[PDB]
C-alpha cells in the first residue's frame, strides 16, 4: 500500500503556503476560501498533487499516507482539554487548511450540522469528560456519507495506530457476494428501508459495513450467513496504520473500514491530536439535506 514521503523542501513549501493562507482568510466562514480552495491546492508541491490523484484515480487501495509534513509543535501549542469553547481559528489553523486543501484535491469538504458544532475540520483528542472503538464504514446508513476521510496527525507521541481494513474477495463465494449485492440489509443511524452491503463492480466491490448497526430480517437466513461471512473476512483482514506527527492518512470510505484503538491519555496537553475532514466527490448529491446551495453542512 503506497505512501509518499515528503522532502523537507516540499514540507517547508507546504508549511509556508498554509501559513500564508492562514493570514489571508482567518476563517472557514468566508465562502471565498471555500471558492479558492482547489486553485490554492494547485499551489501544493506537484508530486504531492500527482500522488493523491493517482490514489483517487487508481481506485485500488483502501488508504494512503503522505508523511513528513512539518507541523510546528511550538506554534501549534498544547493539546486542548476540550474543543468546545475554543476561539477558532486557533494556532493550528494552518494544519486545518492543509487538510481542506487535500480535501479539495479529492473532491469537496463537507460536514454535519449535528457533529462537532458544524466545523468542517474536527478534532480528535482525549477529553477528561468523554473518557470512554471496533470498526466501520463512516455513516454506512447514509446515502450522502463521505467518500474519503482525511486524518492529519498533529501529534502522536505514543504511536497510536488507526485500524484500517480492506475487503479480501478471494475468501468469499460468488453466492454470498450476489446475496450481499441485494437490498436485504438494514443499517441503523448513529423511502427504502433495506439496502445492499456491496455495490459497484461485482469483481472488485465497494462496501458499506457497520457491524454493531447492521441487522437482517430473521426469516432471511442466506443474508444472515453472507453478512457473517463478510464480517469475518473484513475482521480477519484488519491492519494497524500509524499516523505519526506530520502524517496525513487518507481513507477511502468505499474501500475500507476504519476504527480507533483505545489508549491511555495523560490529559496534560501532550496527547495524540488528529484533525479530520470528511470528503464528498459530489456536493450536489446531498442537496436535499443542505439548508442552502452554499452550505457544506448536512442537517
Beta-carbon neighbour count of residue 37 at 10 Å?
18
Cβ-based nearer residue to its own copies, 124 or 289: 289
Q: Is residue 92 involved in binding Fe ion (CB under 5 A)? A: no
Residue 138 binds which entry of its own copies, Fe ion, none, CB below 5-8 Å type-dependent? Fe ion
288 is in an annotated binding site: no
Considering only 5, 53, 82, 113, the residue that binds its own copies (CB under 8 A) is 53
Burial of 123-161, coded b for 16+ CB within 10 Å and e otherwise, reads bbbbeeeeeeeebbbbbbbbebbbbbbbbbbbbbeeebb
276 is in an annotated binding site: yes
Q: Which residues pair with 195 in a beta bridge?
A: 185
Q: What angle do CA 260, 258, 11 make, to 5 degrees?
A: 85
Q: Is residue 201 involved in binding its own copies (CB under 8 A)? A: yes
Considering only 83, 199, 213, 231, the residue that binds its own copies (CB under 8 A) is 199
The least distance separating its own copies from the CB of residue 175, rounded to whole angstroms, comes to 17
Cβ-based nearer residue to its own copies, 60 or 159: 60
Cβ-based nearer residue to Fe ion, 138 or 247: 138
Q: Is residue 191 involved in binding its own copies (CB under 8 A)? A: yes
Residues 6+ apart with CB under 8 A from 41: 49, 101, 102, 104, 105
Q: Is residue 57 involved in binding its own copies (CB under 8 A)? A: yes
The least distance separating its own copies from the CB of residue 72, rounded to whole angstroms, comes to 27
Q: Is residue 36 involved in binding its own copies (CB under 8 A)? A: yes
260 is in an annotated binding site: yes
What the block records as the C-alpha cell of 192 is 427504502
Range 115-174, binding Fe ion (CB under 5 A)? 138
Range 240-299, binding its own copies (CB under 8 A)? 254, 281-285, 287-288, 290, 293-294
| Pairwise CA distance, residues 162 & 274, whole Å | 11
| Pairwise CA distance, residues 268 & 8, whole Å | 30
Question: 121: buried, middle or exposed (CB in 10 Å: 19+, 13-18, 0-12)?
Answer: buried
Query: Among 47, 55, 44, which Cα is nearest to 102's?
Result: 44
Considering only 5, 29, 35, 299, the residue that binds its own copies (CB under 8 A) is 35
Polymer length in residues for the chain: 299
CA-based radius of gyration for the chain: 20
The least distance separating its own copies from the CB of residue 144, rounded to whole angstroms, comes to 12
Site string for its own copies, 14-33 (x = CB under 8 A): -----------------x--
Helix 8-25 vs helix 31-41: angle between axes, to the nearest 10 degrees?
160
Residue nearest Fe ion (C-beta atom): 138
- Which parts of this chain interact with its own copies (CB under 8 A)? 31, 34-36, 38-39, 42, 46, 49-50, 53-54, 57-60, 105, 147, 183, 191, 199-202, 204, 206, 254, 281-285, 287-288, 290, 293-294
Residues tagged in the binding site annotation for Fe(3+): 136, 138-139, 258
- Which parts of this chain interact with Fe ion (CB under 5 A)? 138
Amino acid at each position: 500500500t503506497p505512501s509518499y514521503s515528503l522532502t523537507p523542501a516540499e514540507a517547508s513549501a507546504v508549511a509556508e503556503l498554509t501559513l500564508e493562507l492562514a493570514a489571508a482568510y482567518g476563517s472557514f466562514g468566508d465562502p471565498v476560501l471555500l471558492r479558492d480552495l482547489p486553485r490554492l491546492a494547485a499551489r501544493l508541491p506537484e508530486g504531492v498533487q500527482d500522488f493523491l490523484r493517482e490514489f483517487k484515480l487508481a481506485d485500488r487501495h483502501g488508504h494512503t499516507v503522505i508523511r513528513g509534513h512539518d507541523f510546528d509543535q511550538r506554534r501549534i501549542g498544547p493539546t486542548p482539554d476540550h474543543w468546545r469553547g475554543r476561539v477558532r481559528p486557533g494556532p493550528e489553523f494552518p494544519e486545518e487548511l492543509l487538510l481542506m486543501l487535500y480535501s479539495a484535491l479529492l473532491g469537496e469538504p463537507f460536514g454535519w450540522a449535528t457533529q462537532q458544532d458544524g466545523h468542517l475540520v474536527h478534532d480528535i483528542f482525549p477529553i477528561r469528560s468523554h473518557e470512554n472503538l471496533t470498526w466501520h464504514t463512516e455513516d454506512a446508513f447514509h446515502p450522502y456519507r463521505s467518500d474519503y476521510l482525511i486524518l492529519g496527525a498533529l501529534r502522536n507521541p505514543d504511536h497510536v495506530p488507526t485500524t484500517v481494513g480492506e475487503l479480501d474477495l478471494s475468501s468469499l463465494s460468488a453466492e454470498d457476494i450476489d446475496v450481499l449485492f441485494e437490498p436485504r440489509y438494514h443499517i441503523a443511524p448513529d423511502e427504502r428501508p433495506l439496502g445492499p452491503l456491496l455495490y459497484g463492480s461485482r469483481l472488485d466491490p465497494y462496501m458499506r459495513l457497520d457491524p454493531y448497526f447492521t441487522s437482517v430480517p430473521q426469516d432471511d437466513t442466506d443474508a444472515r450467513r453472507a453478512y457473517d461471512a463478510l464480517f469475518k473476512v473484513v475482521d480477519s483482514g484488519m491492519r494497524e496504520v500509524v499516523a505519526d506527527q506530520g502524517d496525513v492518512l487518507f481513507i477511502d470510505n468505499h474501500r475500507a473500514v476504519h476504527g480507533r484503538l483505545p489508549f491511555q491519555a495523560r490529559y496534560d496537553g501532550t496527547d495524540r491530536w488528529l484533525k479530520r475532514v470528511c470528503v464528498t466527490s459530489d456536493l450536489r448529491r446531498s442537496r436535499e439535506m443542505r439548508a442552502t446551495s452554499a452550505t457544506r453542512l448536512l442537517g
